[PDB]
């Protein structure tokens, strides 16, 4: 579409949009639900405001909260895109056990998108699964209609290569790669964005507001302030819009009603080519990574 170089639709046929991520919820005991009211209310509110895409993960400890919101919302299941992720390091005995647990905690009979959370694991961590073998398990889940689309997070080119090779046919190729993306890290690994877009893999951005979360500021802060003031938006809105213009679907983790509304209201303005390039330039000139440093050092 004109939204994204690779797009998707909910079961009701509605094109996917910006994701409300749950964030991570630290908990002391891993075995129990420990359901956060604050989080359930935030997801319910996001849905009320017009979010139609929720992003969670086994590792975030927030699937049960998403499940509660899906039960209580008036928004039909089929109008909502639910993304979750297999944590390999692993609380589940297998990818298939992770998927069943996801269905259970989410209170759903299918998830829209199921991602391997990271390629950086051993078969000890997964209880006997290489990346390729875990992919084969995702392929099975898709065949059974437990999962609509399958993909990965934090994959570099050679990881994606392994997935293609593990796929019985092109129908089962990875179709999403959710990566750390923002101006200070426009390529989490070598040429990853252009590669994905060339190979029909939607890039999603996690932590797209990293520049704002950072304690340190550089010329980017002033650039974002100016653009926010120009367009009558916030710096966060400018970054989310920048991300969409790069052809990347952002996952944002907002918690206040005002911030939720702002995260949705991105389609009444655009950054000029000059401004996008301004952000690109200052960003590349000030590299900064927040995740998986040792894993990406050579990638």
Provide an overview of this structure.
The protein has helices spanning 37-49, 63-72, 95-106, 123-126, 131-143, 157-166, 192-198, 210-213, 219-231, 235-245, 257-264, 273-284, 293-296; strands spanning 19-21, 53-55, 81-86, 111-116, 147-153, 176-180, 202-206, 249-252. It has 299 residues and is α/β, with parallel strands linked by helices. It starts with 18 loop residues before the first strand and ends with a helix. The radius of gyration is 18 Å and the shape is globular. Helix 1 (37-49) packs across helix 2, helix 2 runs parallel beside helix 3 (95-106) and helix 5 (131-143) packs across helix 6 (157-166). It has an eight-stranded parallel beta barrel, surrounded by four helices. The protein has one domain: NADP-dependent oxidoreductase domain (TIM Barrel), CATH 3.20.20. It is classed as oxidoreductase. Keywords: oxidoreductase, TIM barrel, D-pantoyl lactone. It forms a monomeric assembly.
